[PDB]
Amino acid sequence: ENRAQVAARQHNRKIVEQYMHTRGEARLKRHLLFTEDGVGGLWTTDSGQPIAIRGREKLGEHAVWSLQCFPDWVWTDIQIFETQDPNWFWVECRGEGAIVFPGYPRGQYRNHFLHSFRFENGLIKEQREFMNPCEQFRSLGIEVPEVRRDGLPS
Amino acid sequence: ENRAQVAARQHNRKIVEQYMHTRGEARLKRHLLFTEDGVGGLWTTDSGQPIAIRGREKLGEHAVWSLQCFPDWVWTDIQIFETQDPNWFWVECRGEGAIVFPGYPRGQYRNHFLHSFRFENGLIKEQREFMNPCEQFRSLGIEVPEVRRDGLPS
């Protein structure tokens, strides 16, 4: 049991490292790090519902879009956390790049991120990214509402 | 070395458990789970800067406020992750309760959270919570902006 868990954790860590360092044209093949039915996407959005991309085929299609709308994206300040589950990792990092969304002015987007990676048989079964959407709003020129703080201790 | 790390991780996990299960009036003593100079707070806000509460005395004062403004708050769906660092844990959970913020209508707030816990000498040195502020906006009746999706693949 321990031997199998140690082997899984060490292999899965290398896949997380590879995913987090993938940039440029290599993004077009990042979906090969997933199971055929693997899921990826953004869990923190304006609607409160995740934008989940389901299946290795749709993940590869999404990468094409990502190359147009986040053309130079880089993950920085990467810290990878193994867990007691050899098949579950967390990553704390930052990300940065141009944001080129349809019908918005071109912007520069910087944010802090957390990623969750769950594995099955050596590949990613579920990737999820979590951020503060207010920073993406700012990068797009969208007004961010402000909670009134007058009544709060400061 | 291994023995010291295992002991630290086992003790620190009990403190994370205790923190996540602290409810009601016991919140008034939750700051005793921190070092004297410990820091806690909310890393995801409308401004993009953390609201960090610095020092055990200020943490204790914030709990008084928390009891009025989140009077029945509970953390649910708690999943605690140990890491390769015996002094660093992550928690995935949900939270819910009434929200009674000054100058806003009383509401109901539900959100998904990630917590980071870093330890020093058996107590919490740094706690950070991460959420999607859009859900807190909704709970307060604040309009949430919407990214236009027409040009995005759906």
Ligand SMILES: O=C(c1ccc(O)cc1)c1c(-c2ccc(O)cc2)sc2cc(O)ccc12
């Ligand atoms: O930035 C993204 C994003 C990034 C990565 C990902 O895995 C999924 C979504 C957002 C959107 C989007 C939807 C469909 C697409 O085809 C492309 C983009 S809509 C939206 C709305 C937000 O409030 C914040 C982010 C995004």
Ligand SMILES: O=C(c1ccc(O)cc1)c1c(-c2ccc(O)cc2)sc2cc(O)ccc12
């Ligand atoms: O809900 C919180 C909060 C909760 C826990 C915590 O540890 C720190 C802040 C928010 C605020 C706040 C500031 C000072 C206080 O004295 C009390 C509250 S301002 C604000 C603004 C937001 O966009 C979202 C949440 C909050």
